[PDB]
Every structure is written in structure tokens, then in C-alpha cells.
Design an enzyme around this catalytic site. Structure first.
Site, PDB file in Angstrom:
ATOM      1  N   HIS A 144       0.841  -1.195   0.000  1.00 33.98           N
ATOM      2  CA  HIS A 144       0.000   0.000   0.000  1.00 33.98           C
ATOM      3  C   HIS A 144       0.860   1.222   0.000  1.00 33.98           C
ATOM      4  O   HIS A 144       1.699   1.417   0.885  1.00 33.98           O
ATOM      5  CB  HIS A 144      -0.934  -0.016   1.201  1.00 33.98           C
ATOM      6  CG  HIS A 144      -2.006  -1.084   1.120  1.00 33.98           C
ATOM      7  ND1 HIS A 144      -2.403  -1.810   2.193  1.00 33.98           N
ATOM      8  CD2 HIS A 144      -2.764  -1.534   0.042  1.00 33.98           C
ATOM      9  CE1 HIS A 144      -3.372  -2.675   1.811  1.00 33.98           C
ATOM     10  NE2 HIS A 144      -3.590  -2.501   0.496  1.00 33.98           N
ATOM     11  N   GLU A 200       1.752   3.707   2.996  1.00 29.69           N
ATOM     12  CA  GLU A 200       2.223   3.133   4.263  1.00 29.69           C
ATOM     13  C   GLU A 200       3.744   3.154   4.328  1.00 29.69           C
ATOM     14  O   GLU A 200       4.393   2.114   4.362  1.00 29.69           O
ATOM     15  CB  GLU A 200       1.646   1.724   4.471  1.00 29.69           C
ATOM     16  CG  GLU A 200       0.131   1.763   4.646  1.00 29.69           C
ATOM     17  CD  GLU A 200      -0.567   0.433   4.429  1.00 29.69           C
ATOM     18  OE1 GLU A 200      -1.780   0.444   4.151  1.00 29.69           O
ATOM     19  OE2 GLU A 200       0.068  -0.626   4.530  1.00 29.69           O
ATOM     20  N   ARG A 231      -3.271   4.728  -2.125  1.00 32.71           N
ATOM     21  CA  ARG A 231      -3.165   3.363  -1.584  1.00 32.71           C
ATOM     22  C   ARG A 231      -2.890   2.307  -2.657  1.00 32.71           C
ATOM     23  O   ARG A 231      -2.029   1.433  -2.491  1.00 32.71           O
ATOM     24  CB  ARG A 231      -4.461   3.021  -0.825  1.00 32.71           C
ATOM     25  CG  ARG A 231      -4.687   1.555  -0.466  1.00 32.71           C
ATOM     26  CD  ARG A 231      -6.095   1.377   0.084  1.00 32.71           C
ATOM     27  NE  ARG A 231      -6.454  -0.003   0.409  1.00 32.71           N
ATOM     28  CZ  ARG A 231      -6.198  -0.580   1.581  1.00 32.71           C
ATOM     29  NH1 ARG A 231      -5.552   0.088   2.532  1.00 32.71           N
ATOM     30  NH2 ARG A 231      -6.582  -1.828   1.806  1.00 32.71           N
ATOM     31  N   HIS A 269       2.694  -3.906   6.718  1.00 30.34           N
ATOM     32  CA  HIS A 269       1.707  -2.857   6.462  1.00 30.34           C
ATOM     33  C   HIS A 269       1.728  -1.853   7.591  1.00 30.34           C
ATOM     34  O   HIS A 269       2.413  -2.050   8.598  1.00 30.34           O
ATOM     35  CB  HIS A 269       0.306  -3.468   6.385  1.00 30.34           C
ATOM     36  CG  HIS A 269       0.031  -4.219   5.104  1.00 30.34           C
ATOM     37  ND1 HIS A 269      -0.742  -3.704   4.117  1.00 30.34           N
ATOM     38  CD2 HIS A 269       0.435  -5.479   4.674  1.00 30.34           C
ATOM     39  CE1 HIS A 269      -0.826  -4.592   3.110  1.00 30.34           C
ATOM     40  NE2 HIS A 269      -0.102  -5.675   3.444  1.00 30.34           N
ATOM     41  N   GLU A 319       0.948  -5.031  11.060  1.00 25.49           N
ATOM     42  CA  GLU A 319       0.470  -3.656  10.952  1.00 25.49           C
ATOM     43  C   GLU A 319       1.256  -2.831  11.946  1.00 25.49           C
ATOM     44  O   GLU A 319       1.094  -2.999  13.156  1.00 25.49           O
ATOM     45  CB  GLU A 319      -1.033  -3.562  11.249  1.00 25.49           C
ATOM     46  CG  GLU A 319      -1.911  -4.263  10.218  1.00 25.49           C
ATOM     47  CD  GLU A 319      -2.161  -3.436   8.968  1.00 25.49           C
ATOM     48  OE1 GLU A 319      -1.664  -2.296   8.895  1.00 25.49           O
ATOM     49  OE2 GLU A 319      -2.856  -3.923   8.038  1.00 25.49           O
TER      50      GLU A 319
END
Ligand SMILES: [Zn+2]
Ligand SMILES: [Zn+2]
Ligand SMILES: [Zn+2]
Ligand SMILES: [Zn+2]
Ligand SMILES: [Zn+2]
Length: 304
Positions: free
Chosen positions: A64, A67, A122, A192, A266
Site C-alpha cells: 500500500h 504506508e 493506496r 503494512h 500492521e
């Protein structure tokens, strides 16, 4: 100029992949696994000391575009490998016994776009039939309950699943590489941001992997290890119930290929800065994440 403590544009990261390889020939090799929609080479670093029949761990960053801490982390991992090899017992054992495939940026076209036009982009930068809306969500584009839940059929949406599974050049390239190397790859790690989580399958349906207890315990221990450094609090669990249901994810797909240790990380934070995590946090974020990644790596090495 490249720096591990700043966010680097694609030109800089690309040059770094070449330079870090040339500076460390005994530990790093570089290949291109395909090209993006716009024709950019998708570089992959193989990190480890050559040896016979080595198992591998595959890690990617930059699915993405916005990020940026993800891209920064893949670079930091390689930084750590080349700096501490020979000095630190665990990293040295890891690199002697296994190979790490590090894919620093998957969605290169989107990344460039976040630098030049739209910081909050994104998706990929491919075109869609019957609309001027651009891009597919690469983490909704894999053949894993494809386009059924938590994914949009609208090409103008941020979670657009694409025209078909593996419709994107980037996801096809990644899936092809993993399929071609499936006998050696024992773990799949995908980086991510944000929300501070370690996730494992499944996201595409409310169902659990056969080795759920093992994955749960591993994620729990990795979360605990991460917290030891700065007290950063992560949650963990199967994707569908820990963050949200989402179909077409690479971790679910990798797991369904037989890769038993498949995790999504994440990273920081929990929403104060979100995607625009300041450069001042790169060092701390990367160092604590290293502890979780090394924990998982040691586990894989010890349970072959
Ligand atoms: Zn540098
Ligand atoms: Zn180039
Ligand atoms: Zn993401
Ligand atoms: Zn995410
Ligand atoms: Zn360090």
C-alpha cells in the site's frame, strides 16, 4: 542521499538495492521478479550466506503506497542483517541457515505517486475498463476468497479487488515467485501500517487455519517480545476477527499454498499520525519490529 532514518523516494530505494548488494556480495543478491504496470523493475533481495538446501522466509513491504513505514522497515531489516552479521549470534545463525527474500517495495508505481502527486494514495496505478478511476488494491487481488468480503467491486473504491485475481502485474509477479519457490519458502511475512497488530489467516472467511493454536501462540509471544523495548502494545489474531474480514489478501493466499507461517504486520501507530508517521519514529518503530521478526524467524528455524 539514502538514509535508514528517513523516508526515501523510489529512485533512492532503487539505487540502494543496487548499492547494498554490491557492498555485501557474500550476503546479498538482487533479482527483478517482474515489472509494474508502468514498467518499473520489481526488485527482490536474497539475504543470507550461500549454503545447500536452505529453507527461506519471504518478506514484502510496500503493498500500500501511503504506508511509508512499511517500506522503511524492509530497508531496516537489510540494514540490521549487514550490520550485525558476525557480531550478533542470532542474526548470524539466521543468515547462515536460512535465506530471507526481502521485497522492499511491491507497489512501486503507487509509491512514486505518493511522492509526486498524492501522499494518501493506496492502490496500484493501473487503468480500469469503463472508468477513469485508477488502481486496484493489491491486497484484495490475490486468489483467496477473491472479491467476496471486505473488498469492493467498484474500481473507484480504495479496496477495489481488480478485474480478476492476479489481474495486477505486481501481484501476478509476487504470486509467480512464491509458486516457483514454494518447496523452500517456509514463512511469509507482509508488512503494512497502521494499527499495531500481528495478524494471521483467515481474513476472507470466518474460519481458522489447521495450526491455529500454534499461530496464536507464536503471535502472542512475538507481541510480547516487541513490547519489551518501548512498551508498544500490539494486538494479534486471525484477520477476520482481529481487524476486519477482507478477501484477496496475500497472507491468506500464501497460507493456502501450504506456507504454514503466514503473518501480516500492521506497524505504528494507532491513529495519532496514522499513515503520515513522522520520520522521528522510524528508528524506534523499526527496532521494536525487528524483535518480533527475529522471534518469528527463530521459531521457524527451530521447528522445521
Ligand atoms: Zn544508505
Ligand atoms: Zn528504475
Ligand atoms: Zn496496508
Ligand atoms: Zn492494513
Ligand atoms: Zn538495531
Amino acid at each position: 542521499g539514502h538514509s535508514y532514518e528517513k523516508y526515501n523516494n523510489w529512485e533512492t530505494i532503487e539505487a540502494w538495492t543496487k548499492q547494498v548488494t554490491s557492498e555485501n556480495p557474500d550476503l546479498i543478491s538482487r533479482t527483478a521478479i517482474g515489472t509494474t504496470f508502468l514498467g518499473n523493475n520489481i526488485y527482490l533481495l536474497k539475504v543470507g550466506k550461500p549454503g545447500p538446501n536452505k529453507p527461506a522466509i519471504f518478506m514484502d513491504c510496500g503493498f500500500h503506497a501511503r504506508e511509508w513505514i512499511s517500506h522503511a522497515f524492509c530497508q531496516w531489516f537489510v540494514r540490521e542483517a549487514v550490520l550485525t552479521y558476525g557480531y550478533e549470534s542470532h542474526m548470524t545463525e539466521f543468515l547462515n541457515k536460512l535465506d530471507f527474500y526481502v521485497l522492499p517495495v511491491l507497489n512501486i508505481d503507487g509509491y512514486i505517486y505518493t511522492w509526486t502527486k498524492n501522499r494518501m494514495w493506496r492502490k496500484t496505478r493501473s487503468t480500469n475498463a469503463g472508468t477513469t478511476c485508477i488502481g486496484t488494491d493489491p491486497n484484495r487481488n490475490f486468489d483467496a476468497g477473491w472479491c467476496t468480503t471486505g473488498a469492493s467491486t467498484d474500481p473507484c473504491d480504495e479496496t477495489y479487488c481488480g478485474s480478476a485475481a492476479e489481474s495486477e502485474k505486481e501481484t501476478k509477479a509476487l504470486a509467480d515467485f512464491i509458486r516457483n519457490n514454494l518447496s523452500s519458502i517456509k514463512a511469509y511475512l507482509t508488512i503494512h501500517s497502521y494499527s499495531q497488530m500481528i495478524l494471521y489467516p483467515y481474513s476472507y472467511d470466518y474460519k481458522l487455519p489447521e495450526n491455529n493454536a500454534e499461530l496464536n501462540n507464536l503471535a502472542k509471544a512475538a507481541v510480547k517480545e516487541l513490547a519489551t523495548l518501548y512498551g508498544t502494545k500490539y494486538t494479534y489474531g486471525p484477520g477476520a476477527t482481529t481487524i476486519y474480514p477482507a478477501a484477496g489478501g496475500s497472507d491468506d493466499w500464501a497460507y493456502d499454498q501450504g506456507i504454514k507461517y503466514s503473518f501480516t504486520f500492521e506497524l505504528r501507530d494507532k491513529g495519532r499520525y496514522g499513515f503520515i508517521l513522522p520520520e522521528s519514529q522510524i528508528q524506534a518503530t523499526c527496532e521494536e519490529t525487528m524483535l518480533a521478526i527475529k522471534y518469528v524467524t527463530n521459531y521457524v528455524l527451530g521447528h522445521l
